[PDB]
Structures are given as structure tokens and as C-alpha cells.
Short mmCIF file of C-alpha atoms in Angstrom, two decimals:
data_model
loop_
_atom_site.label_atom_id
_atom_site.label_comp_id
_atom_site.label_asym_id
_atom_site.label_seq_id
_atom_site.Cartn_x
_atom_site.Cartn_y
_atom_site.Cartn_z
CA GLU Q 233 39.36 108.57 -57.27
CA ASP Q 234 38.05 109.12 -53.37
CA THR Q 235 41.01 108.54 -51.83
CA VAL Q 236 39.14 107.39 -48.03
CA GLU Q 237 36.95 104.93 -49.63
CA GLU Q 238 40.01 103.40 -51.40
CA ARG Q 239 41.25 102.72 -47.43
CA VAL Q 240 38.00 101.34 -46.21
CA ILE Q 241 38.14 99.11 -49.60
CA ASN Q 242 41.88 98.32 -49.28
CA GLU Q 243 41.88 97.17 -45.60
CA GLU Q 244 38.72 95.59 -45.69
CA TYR Q 245 40.32 93.46 -48.97
CA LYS Q 246 43.52 93.08 -46.32
CA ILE Q 247 41.59 91.00 -43.93
CA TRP Q 248 39.74 89.26 -46.60
CA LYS Q 249 42.91 88.04 -48.28
CA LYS Q 250 43.74 86.69 -45.06
CA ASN Q 251 41.36 84.35 -44.74
CA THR Q 252 41.16 82.99 -48.42
CA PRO Q 253 42.66 79.47 -47.48
CA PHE Q 254 39.52 79.36 -45.38
CA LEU Q 255 36.71 80.82 -47.75
CA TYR Q 256 38.15 79.33 -50.66
CA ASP Q 257 39.56 75.88 -52.31
CA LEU Q 258 40.88 78.57 -55.34
CA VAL Q 259 41.74 81.97 -56.20
CA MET Q 260 43.76 83.53 -58.89
CA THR Q 261 44.11 87.27 -59.43
CA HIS Q 262 45.78 88.50 -62.85
CA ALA Q 263 45.60 92.73 -63.48
CA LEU Q 264 44.96 93.45 -67.39
CA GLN Q 265 46.73 96.03 -69.03
CA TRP Q 266 42.47 97.81 -69.16
CA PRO Q 267 39.97 96.52 -67.69
CA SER Q 268 36.99 94.03 -69.41
CA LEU Q 269 33.71 95.07 -69.37
CA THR Q 270 32.67 91.41 -70.13
CA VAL Q 271 33.98 87.83 -69.81
CA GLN Q 272 32.19 84.38 -70.17
CA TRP Q 273 34.16 80.89 -70.43
CA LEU Q 274 33.98 79.49 -74.04
CA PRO Q 275 32.97 75.30 -73.17
CA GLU Q 276 36.04 73.87 -74.42
CA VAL Q 277 38.23 72.49 -71.56
CA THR Q 278 41.70 70.37 -71.73
CA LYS Q 279 43.26 68.08 -69.46
CA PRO Q 280 46.62 67.81 -71.43
CA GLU Q 281 48.61 64.62 -70.42
CA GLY Q 282 51.54 65.13 -68.81
CA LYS Q 283 50.97 68.37 -66.58
CA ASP Q 284 49.08 69.28 -63.51
CA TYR Q 285 46.28 71.86 -64.47
CA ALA Q 286 43.92 71.82 -67.22
CA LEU Q 287 43.22 74.48 -70.06
CA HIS Q 288 39.80 76.63 -70.29
CA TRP Q 289 39.10 79.87 -72.14
CA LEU Q 290 37.55 83.04 -71.68
CA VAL Q 291 35.94 85.31 -73.88
CA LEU Q 292 37.03 89.13 -72.93
CA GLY Q 293 37.18 92.91 -74.13
CA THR Q 294 39.49 96.53 -73.27
CA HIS Q 295 37.96 99.31 -71.60
CA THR Q 296 40.40 102.36 -73.23
CA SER Q 297 38.38 105.40 -74.48
CA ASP Q 298 41.74 107.13 -75.89
CA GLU Q 299 43.92 103.74 -77.05
CA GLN Q 300 42.93 101.06 -79.28
CA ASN Q 301 40.30 98.31 -77.42
CA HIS Q 302 40.18 95.17 -78.42
CA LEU Q 303 38.25 91.55 -78.60
CA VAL Q 304 40.08 88.82 -76.66
CA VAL Q 305 39.93 84.62 -76.20
CA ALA Q 306 42.56 84.25 -73.20
CA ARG Q 307 43.61 80.52 -71.97
CA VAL Q 308 44.07 79.77 -68.76
CA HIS Q 309 45.76 77.43 -66.27
CA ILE Q 310 43.44 75.89 -63.68
CA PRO Q 311 45.46 73.56 -61.01
CA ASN Q 312 44.53 70.10 -60.66
CA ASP Q 313 44.07 68.58 -57.20
CA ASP Q 314 47.62 67.87 -56.95
CA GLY Q 315 48.16 79.15 -62.68
CA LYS Q 316 48.63 81.14 -65.92
CA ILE Q 317 46.87 83.83 -68.69
CA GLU Q 318 48.34 83.81 -72.42
CA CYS Q 319 46.31 85.32 -75.07
CA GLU Q 320 44.82 83.08 -77.33
CA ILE Q 321 43.74 84.90 -79.68
CA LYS Q 322 43.57 88.74 -79.77
CA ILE Q 323 40.58 90.94 -82.27
CA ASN Q 324 41.29 94.65 -83.01
CA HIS Q 325 37.96 96.32 -82.16
CA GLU Q 326 36.34 100.01 -82.00
CA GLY Q 327 35.59 101.07 -79.29
CA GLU Q 328 35.54 98.77 -75.96
CA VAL Q 329 33.55 95.87 -75.69
CA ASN Q 330 30.87 96.01 -73.33
CA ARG Q 331 29.59 92.56 -73.78
CA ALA Q 332 30.55 89.91 -76.39
CA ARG Q 333 29.06 86.07 -76.04
CA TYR Q 334 30.62 82.94 -78.25
CA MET Q 335 27.03 81.39 -80.49
CA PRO Q 336 26.63 78.33 -78.63
CA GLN Q 337 26.38 76.06 -82.14
CA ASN Q 338 29.65 77.65 -83.35
CA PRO Q 339 31.83 78.89 -80.38
CA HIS Q 340 33.97 80.41 -83.07
CA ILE Q 341 31.63 82.77 -82.67
CA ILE Q 342 31.63 86.29 -81.15
CA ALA Q 343 29.18 88.84 -81.52
CA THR Q 344 29.77 92.29 -79.46
CA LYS Q 345 28.51 95.88 -78.11
CA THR Q 346 29.94 98.29 -78.80
CA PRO Q 347 30.06 102.16 -77.50
CA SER Q 348 28.58 102.50 -81.06
CA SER Q 349 25.45 101.27 -82.22
CA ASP Q 350 25.56 98.39 -85.01
CA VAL Q 351 25.99 95.19 -83.27
CA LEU Q 352 29.82 93.39 -84.37
CA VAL Q 353 30.38 89.55 -85.50
CA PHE Q 354 33.64 88.26 -85.08
CA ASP Q 355 34.68 84.50 -86.61
CA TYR Q 356 38.11 84.04 -85.08
CA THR Q 357 38.96 81.64 -87.28
CA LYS Q 358 38.74 84.29 -89.92
CA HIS Q 359 40.91 86.70 -87.89
CA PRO Q 360 45.10 87.01 -87.75
CA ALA Q 361 47.07 85.39 -84.61
CA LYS Q 362 48.42 88.81 -83.78
CA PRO Q 363 46.12 91.54 -84.95
CA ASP Q 364 47.69 94.76 -86.80
CA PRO Q 365 48.46 97.25 -85.45
CA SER Q 366 47.42 99.99 -87.56
CA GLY Q 367 43.93 98.87 -85.45
CA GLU Q 368 41.34 98.81 -88.37
CA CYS Q 369 38.01 96.95 -87.18
CA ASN Q 370 36.91 94.22 -89.69
CA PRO Q 371 33.83 92.77 -87.87
CA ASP Q 372 32.93 89.56 -90.12
CA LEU Q 373 28.95 91.37 -90.04
CA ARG Q 374 27.73 94.38 -88.74
CA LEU Q 375 23.88 94.47 -87.69
CA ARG Q 376 22.15 97.66 -88.08
CA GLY Q 377 19.13 98.24 -86.51
CA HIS Q 378 19.77 100.46 -83.04
CA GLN Q 379 19.83 104.50 -82.72
CA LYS Q 380 22.19 103.87 -79.58
CA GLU Q 381 24.61 101.41 -77.81
CA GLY Q 382 23.59 99.41 -74.77
CA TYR Q 383 24.17 96.78 -72.49
CA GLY Q 384 22.15 92.79 -72.98
CA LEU Q 385 22.99 90.53 -75.82
CA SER Q 386 21.92 86.50 -76.42
CA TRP Q 387 21.98 83.99 -78.50
CA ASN Q 388 19.37 81.55 -79.42
CA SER Q 389 20.89 78.04 -78.04
CA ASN Q 390 17.62 76.55 -79.72
CA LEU Q 391 17.58 78.95 -83.40
CA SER Q 392 21.18 78.82 -84.58
CA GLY Q 393 22.35 82.38 -85.95
CA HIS Q 394 18.85 83.79 -84.15
CA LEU Q 395 20.85 86.82 -81.92
CA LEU Q 396 18.70 89.59 -79.22
CA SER Q 397 20.44 92.57 -78.86
CA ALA Q 398 19.09 95.03 -75.19
CA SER Q 399 19.98 98.60 -76.33
CA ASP Q 400 20.06 102.34 -74.35
CA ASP Q 401 17.35 103.67 -77.59
CA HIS Q 402 14.47 101.57 -75.70
CA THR Q 403 14.55 98.74 -78.18
CA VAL Q 404 15.61 95.04 -78.37
CA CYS Q 405 16.98 94.36 -81.97
CA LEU Q 406 16.29 90.59 -83.26
CA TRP Q 407 18.78 89.45 -86.01
CA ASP Q 408 19.03 85.90 -88.10
CA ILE Q 409 23.03 86.66 -89.43
CA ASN Q 410 22.35 83.56 -91.49
CA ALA Q 411 20.18 86.06 -93.93
CA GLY Q 412 22.31 86.87 -96.16
CA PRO Q 413 24.48 90.78 -96.52
CA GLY Q 414 27.70 92.83 -98.12
CA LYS Q 415 28.55 92.79 -94.59
CA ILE Q 416 25.54 94.92 -92.89
CA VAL Q 417 22.45 92.97 -91.55
CA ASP Q 418 19.44 95.05 -91.12
CA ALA Q 419 16.94 93.92 -88.00
CA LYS Q 420 14.62 90.88 -88.78
CA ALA Q 421 12.23 92.64 -86.24
CA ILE Q 422 12.77 95.63 -83.80
CA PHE Q 423 10.90 95.35 -80.15
CA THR Q 424 9.42 98.77 -78.84
CA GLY Q 425 7.55 97.43 -75.71
CA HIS Q 426 9.73 99.37 -72.96
CA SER Q 427 9.38 103.15 -72.54
CA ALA Q 428 12.84 103.25 -71.22
CA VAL Q 429 16.88 101.94 -71.42
CA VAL Q 430 16.67 98.18 -72.12
CA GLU Q 431 19.10 96.92 -69.89
CA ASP Q 432 19.00 93.04 -70.87
CA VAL Q 433 17.33 90.61 -73.12
CA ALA Q 434 17.84 86.78 -72.63
CA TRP Q 435 16.31 84.03 -75.24
CA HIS Q 436 14.51 81.06 -73.09
CA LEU Q 437 16.36 78.00 -73.11
CA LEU Q 438 14.24 75.82 -73.94
CA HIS Q 439 11.34 77.73 -76.08
CA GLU Q 440 13.09 78.96 -79.73
CA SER Q 441 10.19 81.81 -79.59
CA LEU Q 442 10.40 83.21 -76.18
CA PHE Q 443 12.45 85.29 -75.06
CA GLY Q 444 12.58 88.23 -71.91
CA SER Q 445 13.63 92.03 -71.49
CA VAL Q 446 14.40 93.97 -68.58
CA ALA Q 447 14.36 98.15 -68.57
CA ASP Q 448 14.63 100.73 -66.60
CA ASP Q 449 10.87 101.03 -66.60
CA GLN Q 450 10.45 98.85 -64.14
CA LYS Q 451 9.59 95.85 -66.19
CA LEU Q 452 10.04 92.50 -66.92
CA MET Q 453 8.90 91.45 -70.65
CA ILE Q 454 7.85 87.87 -72.02
CA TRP Q 455 7.92 88.30 -75.91
CA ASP Q 456 6.73 85.77 -78.68
CA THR Q 457 8.82 86.04 -81.67
CA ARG Q 458 5.24 84.38 -83.18
CA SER Q 459 3.58 87.55 -82.94
CA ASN Q 460 2.14 89.43 -85.82
CA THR Q 461 2.82 93.09 -83.36
CA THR Q 462 6.53 93.94 -81.97
CA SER Q 463 5.22 96.75 -79.63
CA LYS Q 464 3.34 94.59 -76.56
CA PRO Q 465 4.55 91.68 -74.86
CA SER Q 466 3.29 88.52 -74.28
CA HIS Q 467 3.85 89.09 -70.58
CA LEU Q 468 4.49 92.64 -68.41
CA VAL Q 469 5.78 92.32 -64.99
CA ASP Q 470 5.94 94.80 -62.43
CA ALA Q 471 9.03 93.42 -61.54
CA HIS Q 472 10.93 95.97 -58.92
CA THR Q 473 10.85 99.50 -57.66
CA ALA Q 474 13.46 100.74 -60.23
CA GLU Q 475 16.02 99.75 -62.91
CA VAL Q 476 15.75 96.16 -64.19
CA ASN Q 477 19.53 95.78 -65.23
CA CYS Q 478 19.97 91.64 -66.03
CA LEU Q 479 18.11 88.83 -66.28
CA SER Q 480 18.63 84.64 -66.03
CA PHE Q 481 16.82 82.34 -66.80
CA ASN Q 482 17.09 78.57 -64.29
CA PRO Q 483 18.93 76.31 -67.07
CA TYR Q 484 16.50 73.50 -65.11
CA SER Q 485 13.36 74.42 -65.32
CA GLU Q 486 11.33 75.87 -67.88
CA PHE Q 487 8.88 78.05 -65.58
CA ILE Q 488 11.93 80.06 -63.52
CA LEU Q 489 13.78 82.86 -64.35
CA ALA Q 490 15.61 85.70 -61.70
CA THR Q 491 15.63 89.40 -62.32
CA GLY Q 492 18.07 92.12 -60.63
CA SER Q 493 17.89 95.81 -60.27
CA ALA Q 494 19.05 98.91 -58.47
CA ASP Q 495 17.00 97.98 -55.45
CA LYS Q 496 19.13 95.96 -54.25
CA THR Q 497 17.57 92.68 -55.15
CA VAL Q 498 17.46 89.43 -57.16
CA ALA Q 499 13.69 88.80 -57.46
CA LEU Q 500 12.16 85.06 -58.42
CA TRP Q 501 9.22 84.28 -60.93
CA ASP Q 502 7.67 81.12 -62.61
CA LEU Q 503 6.26 81.68 -65.99
CA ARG Q 504 3.39 80.03 -65.15
CA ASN Q 505 1.69 82.92 -63.32
CA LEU Q 506 3.47 86.28 -63.03
CA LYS Q 507 0.47 87.65 -60.65
CA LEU Q 508 3.27 87.68 -57.59
CA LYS Q 509 7.66 87.27 -57.43
CA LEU Q 510 8.10 84.13 -55.69
CA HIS Q 511 10.94 85.79 -53.47
CA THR Q 512 13.01 88.04 -53.31
CA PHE Q 513 17.19 87.96 -51.94
CA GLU Q 514 18.61 90.81 -49.78
CA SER Q 515 21.99 91.39 -49.01
CA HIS Q 516 23.57 93.22 -51.88
CA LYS Q 517 24.23 96.82 -50.52
CA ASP Q 518 24.18 99.00 -53.77
CA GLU Q 519 22.44 98.61 -57.18
CA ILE Q 520 22.68 94.85 -58.95
CA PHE Q 521 23.62 94.60 -62.54
CA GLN Q 522 24.36 90.69 -63.16
CA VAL Q 523 23.12 87.95 -62.27
CA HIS Q 524 23.99 84.44 -63.70
CA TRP Q 525 22.18 80.40 -62.87
CA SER Q 526 24.61 78.10 -62.03
CA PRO Q 527 25.15 74.85 -64.59
CA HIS Q 528 25.56 72.52 -62.69
CA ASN Q 529 23.06 73.41 -59.10
CA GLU Q 530 19.62 74.37 -60.05
CA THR Q 531 18.92 75.73 -56.71
CA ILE Q 532 21.95 77.69 -57.04
CA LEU Q 533 22.03 81.50 -58.60
CA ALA Q 534 24.64 84.50 -58.21
CA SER Q 535 24.43 88.13 -58.66
CA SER Q 536 26.72 91.50 -58.49
CA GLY Q 537 27.07 94.72 -59.13
CA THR Q 538 28.09 98.32 -57.88
CA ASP Q 539 28.40 96.79 -54.04
CA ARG Q 540 31.79 95.51 -55.27
CA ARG Q 541 30.41 91.95 -53.88
CA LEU Q 542 28.73 88.71 -55.96
CA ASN Q 543 26.40 86.64 -54.28
CA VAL Q 544 25.67 83.24 -54.08
CA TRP Q 545 22.59 82.46 -53.56
CA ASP Q 546 20.72 78.59 -52.31
CA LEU Q 547 17.10 78.50 -53.24
CA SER Q 548 16.94 75.08 -50.85
CA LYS Q 549 17.84 77.24 -47.64
CA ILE Q 550 14.88 79.75 -48.06
CA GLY Q 551 13.33 79.77 -44.12
CA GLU Q 552 15.49 77.91 -42.65
CA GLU Q 553 16.14 78.28 -39.06
CA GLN Q 554 19.26 79.81 -38.26
CA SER Q 555 22.47 80.35 -35.63
CA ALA Q 556 22.45 83.98 -33.84
CA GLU Q 557 25.70 84.27 -35.82
CA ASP Q 558 24.27 83.59 -38.99
CA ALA Q 559 21.35 85.51 -39.15
CA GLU Q 560 23.60 88.39 -38.49
CA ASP Q 561 25.24 87.92 -41.77
CA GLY Q 562 22.15 87.09 -43.87
CA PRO Q 563 18.88 85.45 -44.58
CA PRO Q 564 19.68 81.32 -44.55
CA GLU Q 565 19.17 81.31 -48.70
CA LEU Q 566 22.87 83.58 -48.77
CA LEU Q 567 25.12 80.88 -49.59
CA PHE Q 568 28.80 82.89 -49.78
CA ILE Q 569 29.73 86.22 -50.41
CA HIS Q 570 33.01 86.97 -52.51
CA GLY Q 571 34.79 89.64 -51.16
CA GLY Q 572 37.63 89.33 -53.74
CA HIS Q 573 37.04 92.74 -55.96
CA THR Q 574 38.07 96.44 -55.35
CA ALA Q 575 35.55 97.90 -57.52
CA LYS Q 576 32.14 97.38 -58.85
CA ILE Q 577 32.11 94.10 -60.47
CA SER Q 578 31.79 94.41 -64.56
CA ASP Q 579 30.32 90.88 -64.89
CA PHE Q 580 31.32 87.03 -64.37
CA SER Q 581 30.40 84.17 -65.76
CA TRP Q 582 30.26 80.18 -64.17
CA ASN Q 583 32.73 77.88 -65.87
CA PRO Q 584 30.61 75.16 -67.67
CA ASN Q 585 33.27 72.40 -67.00
CA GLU Q 586 34.91 72.65 -63.45
CA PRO Q 587 31.58 72.63 -60.95
CA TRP Q 588 31.84 76.09 -58.06
CA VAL Q 589 34.32 77.93 -60.26
CA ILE Q 590 33.83 81.51 -61.39
CA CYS Q 591 35.59 84.34 -63.04
CA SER Q 592 34.61 87.87 -62.44
CA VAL Q 593 36.19 91.33 -63.79
CA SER Q 594 36.06 94.49 -61.98
CA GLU Q 595 36.51 98.41 -63.11
CA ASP Q 596 40.22 98.68 -61.93
CA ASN Q 597 41.02 95.99 -64.11
CA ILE Q 598 41.10 92.86 -61.86
CA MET Q 599 39.70 89.43 -63.36
CA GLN Q 600 39.62 86.71 -60.55
CA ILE Q 601 39.19 82.74 -60.48
CA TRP Q 602 37.69 81.58 -57.28
CA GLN Q 603 35.89 78.62 -56.12
CA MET Q 604 34.93 78.45 -52.83
CA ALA Q 605 35.50 76.51 -50.37
CA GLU Q 606 33.91 72.54 -50.29
CA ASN Q 607 32.94 72.95 -46.84
CA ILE Q 608 30.08 76.13 -47.99
CA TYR Q 609 27.78 74.40 -49.86
CA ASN Q 610 28.65 70.76 -48.07
#
């Protein structure tokens, strides 16, 4: 709604669009009726016989303050070397979907964060193919324990049905959704180490007992569910000089993780020694809200936020000599800047089946499916 900034954004986007055949091997844009605050690829892909596309799926949500919201699975066509978006299913949801994540052991089970305190669980096989327009939200489970909404949600990939949530109430709640409800589950544990909004939580990818939390108190905390305290973490890290909004564990190392912050930096961490930060990634011009490691490349990381950019980093290029030209555009470990969004990026997801494909969603209702040009990472 700033008519001056809108022109700057639109003119920069026009230059971006003219360069897309050079910068990308794929760009697909779709404008949603409502913005999505969340995106995550489902794990499934098909290459249907006799078609020139693969089918992939996205978990999305809506954001309308006044009207009916939905949890959405979208069916998308990604064209072969030699697009289209349809609704796979749509489920009535009470309030906007702050975050939606599929359970790795059963990808038709989706947990959501809403604008209210209960975390919701939906089994999409147990909802009608078309939602009832009366709009009632009938979650399969309500997970109680929080006093406020929040923005962080993580399924344990090693212990089926174990879910963490981060909240503006300064806590992390843990549920085992297997523990008999008649549809309400109370938190198994409430972790109170942080003294400010807990922005994000993530399970370790290998150690079933370990998870990390990050908060507006500038701290990264490492928690062990085997500990008989919920007040004191195993490790407390003074991570950033402002709010910490996201964390991501490296899927190729049990030791490495990244955090992103309102200080406009991504930090790199080694669990073996949290007395020192391994690296600071600099180039974002505003608050970072999301970070994700590449599912395919151990040295590749991406970050997004309020500056309307998604940066892709390559750890392997840290410290490399640069041309005068490359030094002007940023540090050597900055692989790519995605400039396709004209508003804050709310979430993004690396495609788990098609290397280098990302889906990113923004506050102006845009969803982009894109892949940087091969000549950039080669």
C-alpha cells in the first residue's frame, strides 16, 4: 500500500522477468485467491505414461481474516525437458494456516498452526473430496498446551507421531499423537527455556531425542527429551544480535545446522562446539524468516524473508577469490538471488524429487515454481 515503493518493486520485477530465460531453466507463476503463509512439497512424484510432465503435490493454506480458510493440497504439472495447478483436496480450516507440515511416516497426515493456540491434525483421507460450504472445521485431533498462536512446527522423522510446536507464549509443546484422546491430546511436555516468543522448532534428522528451538531472545537452544527437566536445555547458544526466526539441520551431517535472524544474517553451527559460530552468510537487506538445506547437495542452503528475496548459498565457495564483477554482487558463497517475488516471502520448499526446483510463496498471493539455470551450480 506504499505507492512509491510499489513502483520501485514493479520496475525491478520487469528487469527480472526480461532476464528469466538466462537466469532460470524453469519459472512458473500462479496467483492464488488468498495468500498462502505456508508451502511444503509432498514426497510423491509420478511421470504418467504418454504425458510431457510429471505430477508433484504442494501442501498450501489460505490467509483471509474475514472469510473461510482452507488447508489445500495442490496437484501441479512440472514440464519435462521435451504448467497446470489443480486442487487435490481442500479442507475447511478455522482461521489462516500459519504452517502446515505432512508427517514423514504417513504423508496424508498434516499438522497445522492456526491463529489460535490448539495445533490441529488432519488425515486428508478422512475428509470429503469437496469441503462443505457451511465451513465447519472438524480436525481429527486438537493438540492442547499452548496459550497463544505461533509459527514453528516439526514432526519427528525417527519417532512416528511425535510433534513439536513453537509459540508466541514463549514455550515449545511436544505431543505423541498416538496417545489416546475424545479428539483432544494434552502436551506430553512443555519446554520453558526461552524468555521470549519461540519463532521456530526443528527435530534433529537422526537423533530421535534431540531438537533445536530459536526465539526472540536471540538464543538457539538444543533440547534432549531424555532429560528430566523442561526448563533447562542441553546447550544454550547466544546465536544472533536480534530475534532468531528459523533453524534447519543439514540432512548430510549429524553435527551441522543453520539459523536465520532479524540481524539479516544466516549463522552456521556445529553441535560438537557451540562456543563459536562457524560462518555468517551476509547479503539479505532485511529480516530473515525461513532457512532450508538442499535435500540433494550437502553444501547448499537457502534463506528468505522480508527483503522479498530468496538467497541460495554454497558453503564450498566460502573464502574463494572473486573477479571485481562478482565481488560487487556479494560474497563468493552467495550462489543465486531469486528476485521473482514482489512482496515478503512467507515460506519456501525444495522439491525432494527434482534437484534445484523450489516453490516459494509471498504475501501478494504469488506462488512460483522455479529452477536456477544449470550454468550457475555447474
